[PDB]
Amino acid sequence: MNIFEMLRIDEGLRLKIYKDTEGYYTIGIGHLLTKSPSLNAAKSELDKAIGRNCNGVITKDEAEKLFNQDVDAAVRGILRNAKLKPVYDSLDAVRRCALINMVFQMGETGVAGFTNSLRMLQQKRWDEAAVNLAKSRWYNQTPNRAKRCITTFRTGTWDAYKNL
């Protein structure tokens, strides 16, 4: 189990624009296109992103390309972030994957705002941090994916996905 397989389980693969849990236009493996209500704003964003006229549809290859970009941008984001960097350096390899997973889902800014939880992960207070992360909108909106992620932080194992 690696970060890519893990995100593929959490986000799914969709070769056609779609709407995210939130009402947003997405495509491939959780690639947020726009928070704008236009199917037309989304299709333009998509062609700009892919560099071809897609007409709301893309190939596997294209989706994977977008995926490679996103995880990479998520890693460099954590590495350049003064709030995130220390937590990450402090963690074991499995728990690191869990922070990349949160960061790919909610962005840098989002996760950087989970101050308390960050402070607990850094302190290695596992159970306590698990409980804290659950008290969020993220958990209430997409509970099963949040739970898998929270369990990875709580245990340091890939159990939650081992099922899937």
Tokens of 120: 């607990």
Active-site residue, from 10, 11, 62, 108: 11
Please indicate whether residue 20 is annotated as part of the active site. yes
Active-site residue, from 5, 10, 20, 128: 20
Sheet-wide strand order for 31-34: 14-19, 25-28, 31-34
**Is residue 3 a contact partner of residue 71, using CB atoms and an 8 Å limit?**
yes
Question: From CA 30, how far away is CA 109, in angstroms rounded?
Answer: 17
Please indicate whether residue 10 is annotated as part of the active site. no
Question: From CA 11, how far away is CA 111, in angstroms rounded?
Answer: 18
Q: Count the Cβ atoms, other than its own, within 10 Å of residue 54.
A: 19
The answer on whether 67 is annotated among ligand-binding residues is no
Question: From CA 7, how far away is CA 97, in angstroms rounded?
Answer: 10
The answer on whether 117 is annotated among ligand-binding residues is yes
- Residue stretches of the annotated binding site for substrate: 32, 104, 117, 132
Residues with catalytic function? 11, 20
